[PDB]
């Protein structure tokens, strides 16, 4: 009613946080086609490598 004028810069901060979060979700996806996977272990790394080799082969 009167307190919303102090929520404008505070909401701008939230918009900045959202844009930082969403920039990497549409830039990393742009050159990979897949969202980043959390929890990369050596099994996952080797298995993505095998994916790359098999895709290159056929």
């Amino acid at each position: 009613l009167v307190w919303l004028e102090a929520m404008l810069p505070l909401g701008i901060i939230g918009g900045m946080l959202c844009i930082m979060g969403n920039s990497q979700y549409y830039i990393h996806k742009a050159y990979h086609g897949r969202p980043k996977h959390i929890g990369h272990d050596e099994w996952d790394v080797a298995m993505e490598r095998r994916d790359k080799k098999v895709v290159e082969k056929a």
Binding site: L1, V2, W3, A6
Partner: protein, 165 residues
């Protein structure tokens, strides 16, 4: 003392219960109307007795009220007034030079209350900050211009305190 009292005052020490009581007050004041004013648009309240910029008044016939009695110059505690007088062509007692040092003026209103003819008054104007020092050395022409520019408000105020002065 009591175990109950020890427990009660140890909890308040650890749970910060006397700081939540201050946070609540500040938050309650957060959602409240503000009391700030838009200075360029709305001005703060004043009084008809307000002592602001000086002005030299004149009679409705167009004759200046100042009779060069120098009674305001002798009461001025700051010695901010200098008056030179002589006999005019008509033989009337009038001032040739009437200048006020606004850098010496203390805005006490002694000159206004000492004038026997209500010639010198302090108008309601308080917004006259200048960019140069000698623009604050008001002379007779400047004071008369102030009186002509603020004549209606000065007259209304002097009418208001006719019941008090």
């Amino acid at each position: 003392k009591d175990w109950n009292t020890v427990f009660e005052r140890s909890i308040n020490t650890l749970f910060l219960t006397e700081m939540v009581r201050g946070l609540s007050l500040t938050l309650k004041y957060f959602f409240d109307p503000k009391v700030t004013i838009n200075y360029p648009f709305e001005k703060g309240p004043l009084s008809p007795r307000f002592r602001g910029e000086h002005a030299l008044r004149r009679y409705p016939t167009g004759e200046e009220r100042c009779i060069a009695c120098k009674l305001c110059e002798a009461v001025c505690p700051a010695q901010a007034i200098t008056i030179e007088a002589e006999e005019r062509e008509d033989g009337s007692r009038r001032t040739t030079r009437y200048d006020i040092d606004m850098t010496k003026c203390i805005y006490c209103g002694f000159c206004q209350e000492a004038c026997p003819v209500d010639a010198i008054v302090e108008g309601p104007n308080f917004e006259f900050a200048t960019e140069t020092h000698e623009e604050l050395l008001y002379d007779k022409e400047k004071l008369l211009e102030n009186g002509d520019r603020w004549e209606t408000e000065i007259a209304e105020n002097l009418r208001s305190e006719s019941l008090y002065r």
